[PDB]
Amino acid sequence: GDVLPVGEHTDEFPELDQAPVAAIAEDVVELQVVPGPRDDWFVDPDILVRTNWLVTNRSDRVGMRLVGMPLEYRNPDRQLPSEGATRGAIQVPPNGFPVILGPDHPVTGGYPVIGVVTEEDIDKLGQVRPGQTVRLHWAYPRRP
Amino acid sequence: RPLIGINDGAGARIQEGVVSLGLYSRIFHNNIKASGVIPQISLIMGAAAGGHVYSPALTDFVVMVDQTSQMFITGPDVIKTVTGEDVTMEELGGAHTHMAKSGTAHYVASGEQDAFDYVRDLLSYLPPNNYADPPLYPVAIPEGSIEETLTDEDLELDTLIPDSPNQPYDMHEVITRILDDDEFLEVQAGYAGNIVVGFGRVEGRPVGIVANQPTQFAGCLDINASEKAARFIRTCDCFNIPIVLLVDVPGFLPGTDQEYNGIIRRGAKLLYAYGEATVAKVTVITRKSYGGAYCVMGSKDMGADVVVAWPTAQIAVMGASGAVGFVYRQQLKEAAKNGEDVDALRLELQQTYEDTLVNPYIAAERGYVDAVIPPSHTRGYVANALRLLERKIVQMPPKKHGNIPL
Amino acid sequence: QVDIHTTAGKLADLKRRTEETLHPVGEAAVDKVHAKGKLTARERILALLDEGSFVELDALAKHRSTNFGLEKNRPLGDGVITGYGTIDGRDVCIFSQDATVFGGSLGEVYGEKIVKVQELAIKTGRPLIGINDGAGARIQEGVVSLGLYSRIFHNNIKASGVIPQISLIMGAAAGGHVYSPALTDFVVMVDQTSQMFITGPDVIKTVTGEDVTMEELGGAHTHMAKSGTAHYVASGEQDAFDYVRDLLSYLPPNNYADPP
Amino acid sequence: YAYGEATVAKVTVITRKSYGGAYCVMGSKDMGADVVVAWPTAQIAVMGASGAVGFVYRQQLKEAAKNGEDVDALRLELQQTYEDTLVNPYIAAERGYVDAVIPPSHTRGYVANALRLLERKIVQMPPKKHGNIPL
Amino acid sequence: RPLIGINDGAGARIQEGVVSLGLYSRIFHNNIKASGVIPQISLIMGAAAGGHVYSPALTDFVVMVDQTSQMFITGPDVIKTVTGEDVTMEELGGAHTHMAKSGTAHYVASGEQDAFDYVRDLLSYLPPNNYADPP
Amino acid sequence: YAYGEATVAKVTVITRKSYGGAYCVMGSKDMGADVVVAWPTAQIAVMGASGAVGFVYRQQLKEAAKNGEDVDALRLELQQTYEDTLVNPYIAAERGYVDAVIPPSHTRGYVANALRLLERKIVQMPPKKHGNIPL
Amino acid sequence: DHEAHIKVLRGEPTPEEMAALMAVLASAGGGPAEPVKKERNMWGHPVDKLRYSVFSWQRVTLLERTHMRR
Amino acid sequence: APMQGTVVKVAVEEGQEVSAGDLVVVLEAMKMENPVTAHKDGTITGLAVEAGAAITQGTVIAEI
Amino acid sequence: GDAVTAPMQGTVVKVAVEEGQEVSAGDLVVVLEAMKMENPVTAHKDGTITGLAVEAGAAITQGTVIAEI
Ligand SMILES: CCC(=O)SCCNC(=O)CCNC(=O)[C@H](O)C(C)(C)COP(=O)(O)OP(=O)(O)OC[C@H]1O[C@@H](n2cnc3c(N)ncnc32)[C@H](O)[C@@H]1OP(=O)(O)O
Ligand SMILES: CCC(=O)SCCNC(=O)CCNC(=O)[C@H](O)C(C)(C)COP(=O)(O)OP(=O)(O)OC[C@H]1O[C@@H](n2cnc3c(N)ncnc32)[C@H](O)[C@@H]1OP(=O)(O)O
Ligand SMILES: CCC(=O)SCCNC(=O)CCNC(=O)[C@H](O)C(C)(C)COP(=O)(O)OP(=O)(O)OC[C@H]1O[C@@H](n2cnc3c(N)ncnc32)[C@H](O)[C@@H]1OP(=O)(O)O
Ligand SMILES: *C(=O)CCCC[C@@H]1SC[C@@H]2NC(=O)N[C@@H]21
């Protein structure tokens, strides 16, 4: 029963009947991740790209919560000074399961960002449903 | 006689000298000689490294096993040394990589037995060589007219096409209904899914199907589909297998990525393959065939032998939305100056253009479509046409070989 | 009517157009043809070919001319019926000219349709039957029709000695219509209802003063006993088709086949 | 037959009339004339205007008589209109049945140049043992 | 004998409709027949759009003029509507893009006279047909 | 495919490296190069000596590492012995995969001789409609 | 007599069971396989589609052989 | 079930008659409780799901 | 059924839970390495781990029962 107004249109007119678009993947989604900045916090960060992550039912517009091989902190008692965050940043809360921030993410985060999905791929996160598999690859060589 | 190679190997045996490279050169030169003479099939069932990869590439069909086989020229350790890219051998050369990305594999078997079963299926369609007759199965042709012999499975085609020109449908619903037993051996099923290519039979005759798939990129042609279909067509033409095209193409896939990667140079491959091919070539047009993609997908002057269209076909230079902007730019300027309801005028003009010209009947009037048929007629029409066209003589200027755009 | 913006409605419209291809100038002209006792161009094909074997090409074609008001009347098929089918189970390509549409005179699209079935026959190596009944070139279209006549004659010369070509003459062939038969291998005429002549009695009278009927000038008896151009003179259209099926029973499909 | 069969270089120069079926016989383009040139005086038509205007403008030229008009003059005006419009090389040139319309003096140059271009030809015909020319 | 096309473009004439597509199909079929038989050269000297681009692609050599010729299948505004990227005709399809990126061009001339010079140079090496010897 | 198919005269001049599969692609003798010559500086090998020695001497390079020896200096000594033994034109000349090893100045002489003699090559492929180049 | 007959190698049926066997086998038996009117028609035979070098021996041992073999 | 989620409530009895617009089940998913609403009057036949069970999209909750 | 079963033939690189631990649907049970990739196995129902029959470093066949409930 909500009523939505339709705005006044510009003078331009629709000149194309349809756009071809690549079909959205049904299960395994593969993403290109820029490494770090806090990838040195972990005992073995390449588990991030070696793991078939599974998307949990907790995923929403604030963030997508994965399960997989736990990531191990190099110093598990180390606290992080809270820092700015962005859509597609892959946080690793101290339980070791990654979270990929969505559009409604808080402006600053409390957990180390192990990587960020490239702008090429962030919008694919917008379509991944719970129960899909995710694979990650480093967008360029991670070296400390 | 067909040659089957089963390939595993860590490339050249490094302790043997350049002799091993001489033997590679001889094996490659034989694959080139045999190219288009005998069916060549490569099974890859392990890591094929270095020179082991180029013989498969020169053979006609590549079958891989989905986790136990890889192909790569340069190993992960050299890639790491030269670029820093830390990659597993499966990510580098795996069967999924060579299907979905590189386009090299033709099939990805779930196991070795499944790979052998697919290779036997392939061999069952091919003749032993480019001059022997193809292996027809015995099929008894029923008597009476095409309209007298419609099955209920044919009548399921009359309701297939969605009413909206833009709602997609699975083209396999056509392919499996016009092929015998619904039997269809798809080739490169995982690669460039906007075009479907593969073998079937029509009244026992082997045929190659090439069909636009509306469910991917709305059926547009792109670089990968153009190469997928071009080599399949040239493989059928080597071995005298008739081709049947199912056309439903809105155009080429727009984008700067396609332009910068060479859609002009590599789309011209499918023109070359179809114009060169001298087998029987039947086109069935289902919905769209626009612009240059009409030329590519089996146009009459590209030497399509029989072209039939369904009532839902749409053969036009471009979609009416784009065409009206040229064809009536005068009236649209006058209406803009007069401050008229320009959008309502554009809708009136567009619906007039669609009703008048975006249909099969203009191409039928000009003889580019030999008949417009009820969709259910398609199986009978295609079979009857292949039976007419089973022998062709076509004159071509004498040449050493063509110069297909690479 | 079913909404044309729907798939079922587009199929109903195709069925409507196909129905309109059976009588493109109205049933009254088919009734005139039957009152004259001749078959229609379609019935000639369906009587010659084996039942249900006829597959029609370019059924929905319409002429493109706008000279002298032709754009006001665009009959479907453009006055010729073209296709293929079987005689005694062997495939043949066929065309049959319809004297009800512009007198059967050859236009541009008419010629393109004949050229199409010629090229199909030459390609596939199958006999070609032509049924001829047309008042020459369609004068309103001008020289385009002469270019189509040249293209048809050139295809008859290409096919000459490659595939068996048979011509049935079943009405008045005037002007250019006479040479394609003369280039084919066998000409079968019907003894009182067909003629061939290059130019008609009125021109012959004007130039020479000879006064002559079309029947004496170019009838089937004249072209048998005098000119030597006809190979059979059938008592009627069924007898002509029976002679054509007899002829085809002796001939191979092409010069690279053995006689059956 | 002989002209359509011949595969040597075939050049056609059209001077004055080329009417009807005799245009088809005498070196028409679609009979495989390699180069067709016409002089300005060429007249390419289905038939002479006096015959065509008896067939076009039919009914119109008889309702003129039923209205009592001087159809004997009207038919001459229709003839002049038909000849001025259609009985010339340019309709065939517009259809590309004549490859060039040339000043008559150009004929020797065009013929020599055409023959020099056409001195080598490949033309391919269906395979046959021999033709069946009308005897 | 060699065939030179000086392609300029703007695609199919939209008012004429499907006949322009059938004529494109015929032109492409002849480019394929001629492929490997006679040397084919395409000079691009304007915005070759749509159907105009496949014929050059089927010819043997494509010479483009640097700042003043373009090739693309589909224009920047349809690209903008689908892909959202803004691009100019020059960036999308200029001679630099078809040399360095797409690999479709064989030469990028500094001007039309330089393009003609390069075409004459090519022809100086190529024979008239595959049955002839190189000069 | 293009090189193996080509039936014109084919000459190869090797100047430094020709390693691995690129030896095969760049005009190897068994691919049907008509004349192969190499400069004194040519280096024809299955792979570069670094990569080759690490593989061929796996036994010694593991054993020395378990002994804790100067494996790096051992690798340099083995690599030098391999480069001096096998990475030269002479093993290919011994196999006859290079027809002559020549002073570089002789290159134009050998090329011109070959091109003058091979202007007609009496060579053929198995009959085919066409090949099936990987596309 | 030198025809190859059907043998009931084991069993001893009655004439009714013989008749049933024969009527089954006789109506199962294949029809006109290898048909009597397999005409020759060399139009567009694949051997004519191949490119042959002007000196190719296959012009003798394939092309001419295939046309002339009867 | 319009999505994968956990059946936090099943709101009706086996065989129970239901009216269009009543609730059959509630699924936790998307960090949100999603109600499942009956689209027609009928009888809840063979209620195949248990409270706290996880289920996958497109599974039948009941026939209607 | 109440059995958690291995979806693939692989090696147990990490056991995440112990018997009598409470678990909720979608909690991690074990990780299997195969083909150089590591894959989670997760609880299908709320309950508590019983019948635990695998250990880190065990290579297990496809369909191996890991635990119940
Ligand atoms: C142009 C082609 C070239 O240049 S070949 C250069 C690359 N060849 C290589 O040897 C390195 C790349 N790949 C490998 O060799 C790997 O072994 C591959 C094929 C990927 C498989 O690895 P994996 O299954 O672990 O085998 P491995 O390394 O333990 O070797 C097993 C036995 O095979 C042998 N082997 C292997 N490759 C070669 C070769 N190219 N030439 C000669 N021998 C080779 C190994 O020496 C070993 O034999 P052994 O156990 O030492 O008796
Ligand atoms: C190749 C060089 C040429 O110019 S050859 C041109 C030949 N012209 C003619 O013969 C004129 C046609 N008049 C005739 O009498 C013919 O010989 C025919 C039709 C064969 C005699 O048959 P008949 O049974 O007497 O019929 P009809 O003449 O009464 O038929 C009149 C209807 O046919 C039409 N028709 C006829 N010929 C043409 C023609 N060439 N071009 C255009 N229309 C033609 C008449 O217009 C008339 O049709 P309608 O009733 O007016 O709709
Ligand atoms: C299968 C082929 C297709 O689908 S082509 C479909 C799209 N056709 C195009 O318009 C080509 C792409 N368009 C462009 O990017 C530019 O407009 C092109 C044509 C390349 C260059 O035009 P430009 O130099 O800007 O001139 P302009 O836009 O002022 O137009 C000048 C006159 O040319 C005409 N014109 C142009 N293209 C066409 C065409 N395809 N069909 C018909 N007419 C065309 C314009 O109407 C205009 O005529 P006028 O001078 O305004 O009377
Ligand atoms: C849902 O579980 C995703 C939560 C993502 C936002 C919250 S806010 C408080 C924590 N701090 C942070 O950076 N992300 C977490």
Side-chain angles (χ1 to χ4, degrees), chain A residues 1-7 9-10 13-14 16 18-26 28-29 31-43 45-68 70-71 73-78 80-118 121-144, chain B residues 1-7 9-76 78-79 81-84 86-90 92-138 140 142 144 146-147 149-151 153-181 184-256 258-333 335-336 338-347 349-395 397-406, chain C residues 2-14 16-18 21-26 28-31 33-50 52 54-57 59-90 92-107 109-111 113-118 120-190 192-201 203-204 206-209 212-215 217-245 247-257 259-260, chain D residues 1-58 60-61 64-65 67-68 70-71 73-76 78-82 84-124 126-135, chain E residues 1-65 67-76 78-85 87-90 92-120 122-132 134-135, chain F residues 1-58 60-61 64-65 67-68 71 73-76 78-82 84-118 120-135, chain G residues 4-13 15 17 19-23 26 28-33 35 40-70, chain H residues 1-13 15 20-21 26-27 29-32 35-38 42 45-46 48 51-56 58-59 62, chain I residues 1 3-7 10-17 20 25-26 28-32 34 36-37 39-41 43-44 47 51 53 56-60 63 66-67:
Chain A
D2 283 343
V3 179
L4 308 177
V6 178
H9 64 74
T10 189
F13 185 92
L16 182 70
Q18 68 169 351
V21 185
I24 299 162
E26 294 175 30
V28 188
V29 165
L31 309 173
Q32 302 292 327
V33 178
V34 177
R38 281 67 175 90
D39 68 297
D40 63 339
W41 281 52
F42 304 101
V43 178
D46 297 308
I47 289 172
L48 189 73
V49 299
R50 168 160 33 102
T51 302
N52 279 310
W53 302 98
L54 178 281
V55 182
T56 70
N57 302 338
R58 302 188 74 171
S59 303
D60 61 40
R61 281 179 56 92
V62 190
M64 182 187 299
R65 311 190 83 153
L66 308 182
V67 293
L71 292 163
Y73 275 56
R74 195 186 304 281
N75 296 92
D77 56 359
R78 188 179 184 181
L80 179 75
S82 303
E83 68 190 356
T86 202
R87 192 174 103 278
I90 310 182
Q91 291 190 335
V92 188
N95 69 5
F97 294 135
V99 168
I100 311 192
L101 295 184
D104 294 345
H105 75 85
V107 172
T108 62
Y111 303 117
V113 47
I114 192 166
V116 182
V117 179
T118 50
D121 276 339
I122 296 163
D123 282 346
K124 305 196 318 208
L125 295 165
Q127 297 298 346
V128 190
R129 67 171 64 153
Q132 286 196 243
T133 316
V134 173
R135 297 180 186 146
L136 307 177
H137 311 279
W138 302 125
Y140 64 81
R142 184 191 81 72
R143 283 172 290 203
Chain B
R1 292 301 184 263
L3 178 71
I4 299 96
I6 293 150
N7 307 259
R13 191 182 300 168
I14 293 161
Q15 295 92 339
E16 305 194 31
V18 301
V19 62
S20 60
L21 305 180
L23 270 301
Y24 276 128
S25 290
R26 214 179 304 155
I27 291 168
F28 303 162
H29 191 264
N30 287 335
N31 284 138
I32 293 159
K33 285 198 295 273
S35 188
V37 183
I38 53 168
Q40 300 180 96
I41 303 184
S42 296
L43 281 153
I44 317 301
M45 313 191 95
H52 270 63
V53 308
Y54 280 118
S55 175
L58 293 166
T59 66
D60 304 309
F61 303 98
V62 183
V63 179
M64 300 193 69
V65 187
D66 77 340
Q67 293 293 322
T68 62
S69 73
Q70 291 90 29
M71 298 194 283
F72 49 91
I73 297 169
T74 301
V78 174
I79 291 177
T81 302
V82 171
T83 72
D86 194 319
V87 67
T88 58
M89 201 170 302
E90 179 57 27
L92 177 68
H96 184 77
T97 288
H98 285 301
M99 178 60 70
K101 302 185 181 180
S102 81
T104 311
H106 295 79
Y107 182 66
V108 174
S110 64
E112 306 211 354
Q113 293 296 333
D114 187 57
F116 304 147
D117 294 341
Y118 189 89
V119 171
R120 297 197 217 86
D121 292 344
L122 270 178
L123 290 168
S124 79
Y125 293 101
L126 295 160
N129 60 59
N130 68 11
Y131 62 82
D133 296 284
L136 267 64
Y137 291 177
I146 293 170
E147 190 155 49
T149 54
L150 302 178
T151 66
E153 178 187 317
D154 301 308
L155 293 171
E156 294 168 4
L157 294 177
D158 291 351
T159 68
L160 175 64
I161 299 295
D163 302 282
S164 174
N166 306 326
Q167 174 69 1
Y169 63 96
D170 184 3
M171 182 63 76
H172 298 87
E173 296 302 315
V174 187
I175 297 170
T176 59
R177 286 186 174 81
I178 70 178
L179 294 177
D180 299 344
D181 304 342
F184 176 61
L185 188 76
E186 195 166 344
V187 171
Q188 290 205 295
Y191 181 60
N194 51 310
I195 200 151
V196 171
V197 309
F199 295 105
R201 293 178 190 269
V202 182
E203 301 181 342
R205 301 171 183 275
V207 299
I209 299 304
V210 177
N212 300 111
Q213 172 63 310
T215 61
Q216 271 275 29
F217 295 119
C220 291
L221 288 168
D222 81 297
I223 290 173
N224 297 352
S226 304
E227 294 192 328
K228 173 175 176 183
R231 200 180 188 212
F232 182 77
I233 287 164
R234 273 170 55 93
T235 305
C236 296
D237 187 60
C238 289
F239 303 122
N240 312 305
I241 290 168
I243 63 179
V244 181
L245 268 62
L246 309 179
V247 183
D248 190 349
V249 65
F252 280 86
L253 174 63
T256 48
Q258 298 302 297
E259 209 65 58
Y260 299 166
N261 285 284
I263 187 63
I264 291 172
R265 178 172 55 91
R266 301 206 261 163
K269 287 168 175 182
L270 185 55
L271 285 172
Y272 204 103
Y274 190 81
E276 180 188 43
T278 65
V279 287
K281 304 186 295 197
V282 183
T283 306
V284 186
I285 303 176
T286 59
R287 293 196 190 143
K288 299 185 181 187
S289 197
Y290 291 161
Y294 159 89
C295 305
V296 180
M297 289 301 301
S299 61
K300 190 73 184 184
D301 305 71
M302 289 286 294
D305 295 308
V306 172
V307 183
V308 294
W310 294 1
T312 56
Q314 296 181 318
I315 302 160
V317 176
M318 66 203 305
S321 306
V324 164
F326 281 87
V327 169
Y328 301 101
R329 209 196 300 110
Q330 293 287 22
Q331 301 195 5
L332 299 173
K333 283 180 294 182
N338 292 355
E340 296 176 32
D341 192 5
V342 173
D343 288 20
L345 177 63
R346 276 190 172 240
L347 290 182
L349 292 174
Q350 174 167 350
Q351 189 169 12
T352 301
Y353 192 99
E354 289 182 21
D355 289 349
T356 307
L357 301 179
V358 188
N359 64 57
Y361 305 112
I362 311 303
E365 280 179 39
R366 297 218 62 148
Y368 299 149
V369 170
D370 299 310
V372 191
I373 68 175
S376 47
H377 282 41
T378 303
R379 179 183 59 75
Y381 238 90
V382 170
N384 176 280
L386 288 168
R387 195 162 66 228
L388 176 71
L389 299 167
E390 69 159 17
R391 287 171 239 249
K392 285 175 54 171
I393 289 191
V394 172
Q395 272 63 46
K399 70 186 74 185
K400 184 191 289 179
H401 55 69
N403 194 21
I404 183 167
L406 300 188
Chain C
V2 187
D3 183 0
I4 192 65
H5 309 78
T6 70
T7 292
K10 291 174 185 176
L11 181 59
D13 197 51
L14 175 64
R16 187 191 62 77
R17 290 178 197 247
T18 303
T21 70
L22 304 182
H23 45 73
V25 293
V30 172
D31 293 343
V33 175
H34 294 166
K36 290 185 178 183
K38 312 173 56 175
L39 295 177
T40 69
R42 191 168 290 278
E43 287 176 323
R44 291 170 169 172
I45 288 182
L46 298 175
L48 178 57
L49 302 187
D50 308 329
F54 185 53
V55 177
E56 189 174 353
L57 303 174
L60 303 179
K62 284 181 293 177
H63 78 72
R64 299 186 295 258
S65 185
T66 63
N67 296 350
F68 303 115
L70 283 188
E71 73 294 337
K72 286 177 278 282
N73 190 12
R74 299 175 74 216
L76 291 165
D78 194 17
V80 68
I81 303 175
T82 42
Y84 64 89
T86 65
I87 290 173
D88 301 331
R90 289 188 295 156
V92 299
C93 296
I94 190 160
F95 67 82
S96 181
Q97 298 170 355
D98 191 343
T100 66
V101 172
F102 304 110
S105 61
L106 185 145
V109 172
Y110 184 126
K113 286 182 61 170
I114 293 173
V115 168
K116 185 179 289 188
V117 287
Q118 284 179 318
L120 180 63
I122 296 161
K123 172 187 292 185
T124 59
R126 294 295 171 190
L128 176 69
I129 297 95
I131 316 184
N132 302 267
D133 189 354
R138 195 179 302 164
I139 297 161
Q140 291 87 336
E141 301 197 8
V143 307
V144 64
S145 63
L146 306 182
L148 275 306
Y149 273 120
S150 288
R151 207 175 299 154
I152 288 167
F153 301 161
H154 190 59
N155 280 329
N156 285 139
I157 296 157
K158 279 159 59 192
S160 179
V162 184
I163 52 162
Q165 300 171 102
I166 298 178
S167 296
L168 281 152
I169 322 298
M170 310 191 90
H177 273 72
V178 308
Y179 280 121
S180 176
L183 296 169
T184 66
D185 304 307
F186 303 99
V187 184
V188 178
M189 299 194 68
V190 192
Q192 292 288 267
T193 58
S194 66
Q195 290 89 28
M196 299 192 290
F197 45 82
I198 287 179
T199 196
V203 178
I204 291 178
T206 303
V207 176
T208 69
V212 69
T213 60
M214 279 162 51
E215 183 56 25
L217 175 66
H221 183 74
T222 292
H223 286 303
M224 178 64 71
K226 300 185 182 178
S227 82
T229 309
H231 296 83
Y232 183 67
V233 171
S235 65
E237 303 205 14
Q238 292 294 352
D239 188 51
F241 303 144
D242 293 340
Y243 193 91
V244 171
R245 296 198 225 82
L247 262 177
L248 288 165
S249 78
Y250 298 97
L251 296 159
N254 59 70
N255 69 295
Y256 285 170
Chain D
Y1 198 103
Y3 188 83
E5 180 189 45
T7 63
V8 290
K10 304 185 299 200
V11 177
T12 301
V13 184
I14 309 175
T15 59
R16 280 268 221 70
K17 295 186 169 191
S18 192
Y19 290 170
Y23 159 93
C24 305
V25 177
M26 291 300 300
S28 55
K29 172 58 67 178
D30 305 72
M31 286 295 294
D34 294 309
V35 176
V36 182
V37 298
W39 292 4
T41 50
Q43 297 193 341
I44 306 171
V46 172
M47 68 201 307
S50 319
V53 167
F55 216 107
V56 184
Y57 309 117
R58 208 221 305 276
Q60 170 166 359
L61 195 57
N67 293 352
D70 189 13
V71 297
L74 179 62
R75 189 188 269 240
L76 295 178
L78 295 173
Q79 281 190 54
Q80 285 261 288
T81 301
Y82 188 100
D84 284 354
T85 308
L86 298 176
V87 186
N88 62 47
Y90 304 115
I91 308 301
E94 283 168 18
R95 296 213 68 121
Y97 295 170
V98 171
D99 300 316
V101 189
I102 68 176
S105 45
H106 286 40
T107 304
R108 183 181 59 77
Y110 262 81
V111 170
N113 201 345
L115 291 169
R116 188 165 65 223
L117 179 74
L118 301 169
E119 68 174 358
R120 280 175 263 242
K121 281 173 53 167
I122 290 189
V123 161
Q124 297 172 280
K128 68 181 75 183
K129 190 188 301 182
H130 55 73
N132 193 21
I133 186 168
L135 297 189
Chain E
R1 283 290 153 186
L3 178 69
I4 296 90
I6 313 184
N7 300 71
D8 198 318
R13 195 181 298 171
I14 298 157
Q15 294 94 332
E16 299 199 12
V18 300
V19 61
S20 64
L21 308 182
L23 270 301
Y24 276 121
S25 289
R26 203 176 298 162
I27 289 166
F28 303 163
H29 192 55
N30 286 338
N31 280 143
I32 294 157
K33 279 157 57 189
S35 176
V37 180
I38 51 164
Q40 300 179 99
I41 300 175
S42 298
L43 284 147
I44 320 300
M45 296 190 155
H52 278 85
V53 308
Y54 312 99
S55 172
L58 295 167
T59 67
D60 305 306
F61 303 92
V62 182
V63 178
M64 298 192 68
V65 185
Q67 210 64 31
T68 62
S69 70
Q70 292 90 22
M71 302 197 291
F72 43 83
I73 293 175
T74 178
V78 177
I79 287 179
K80 175 59 176 188
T81 303
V82 173
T83 305
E85 178 156 58
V87 70
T88 65
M89 281 168 50
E90 183 54 31
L92 177 67
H96 179 76
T97 292
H98 288 300
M99 180 61 71
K101 295 178 179 177
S102 90
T104 309
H106 296 79
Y107 185 62
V108 175
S110 66
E112 304 196 1
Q113 293 291 352
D114 189 57
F116 301 148
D117 293 346
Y118 192 92
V119 170
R120 299 196 218 89
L122 273 173
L123 289 169
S124 76
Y125 301 102
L126 294 161
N129 60 68
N130 74 297
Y131 276 80
Chain F
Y1 187 103
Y3 188 84
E5 179 177 70
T7 61
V8 290
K10 306 186 299 205
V11 181
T12 304
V13 186
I14 307 174
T15 64
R16 291 189 187 156
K17 300 189 181 89
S18 190
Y19 293 168
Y23 166 88
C24 307
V25 182
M26 293 302 300
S28 58
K29 191 71 182 185
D30 281 17
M31 279 292 291
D34 305 315
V35 176
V36 184
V37 298
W39 290 7
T41 53
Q43 294 182 302
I44 307 170
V46 172
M47 68 201 305
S50 53
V53 156
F55 182 79
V56 171
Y57 297 105
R58 261 180 174 192
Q60 305 199 20
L61 295 173
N67 296 356
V71 173
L74 174 62
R75 287 184 80 109
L76 265 290
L78 291 172
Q79 183 177 331
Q80 187 65 49
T81 304
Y82 185 98
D84 289 330
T85 304
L86 298 182
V87 187
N88 62 46
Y90 303 118
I91 311 302
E94 278 175 28
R95 283 287 178 164
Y97 297 171
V98 173
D99 299 320
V101 187
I102 64 172
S105 45
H106 291 23
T107 302
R108 183 183 61 75
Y110 273 80
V111 172
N113 173 259
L115 298 180
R116 184 164 63 236
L117 296 175
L118 298 165
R120 172 189 61 200
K121 277 174 54 174
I122 305 159
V123 304
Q124 60 180 301
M125 309 216 82
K128 63 186 75 183
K129 286 179 59 179
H130 49 72
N132 197 26
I133 193 171
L135 199 63
Chain G
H5 302 149
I6 296 173
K7 301 185 175 183
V8 181
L9 295 178
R10 217 174 186 81
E12 182 61 87
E17 292 151 24
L21 177 71
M22 288 276 90
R40 177 181 163 103
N41 183 356
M42 302 298 291
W43 190 262
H45 191 288
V47 299
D48 291 328
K49 302 186 178 290
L50 316 185
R51 297 180 184 138
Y52 301 87
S53 177
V54 305
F55 54 84
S56 195
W57 191 242
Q58 278 63 240
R59 290 178 173 269
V60 177
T61 63
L62 181 62
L63 182 64
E64 175 200 277
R65 176 77 136 120
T66 299
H67 279 291
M68 290 298 283
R69 172 148 52 171
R70 191 61 56 134
Chain H
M3 66 197 83
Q4 179 191 288
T6 299
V7 186
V8 294
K9 172 177 288 192
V10 55
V12 292
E13 345 296 344
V26 183
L27 307 180
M30 291 196 49
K31 315 180 90 150
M32 187 179 73
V36 178
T37 300
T45 297
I55 64 172
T56 302
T59 195
Chain I
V4 177
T5 56
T11 182
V12 181
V13 288
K14 133 148 297 303
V15 182
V17 295
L28 185 71
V29 188
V30 300
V31 183
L32 306 179
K36 293 179 275 71
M37 290 283 284
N39 310 269
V41 182
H44 43 33
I60 64 178
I66 288 156

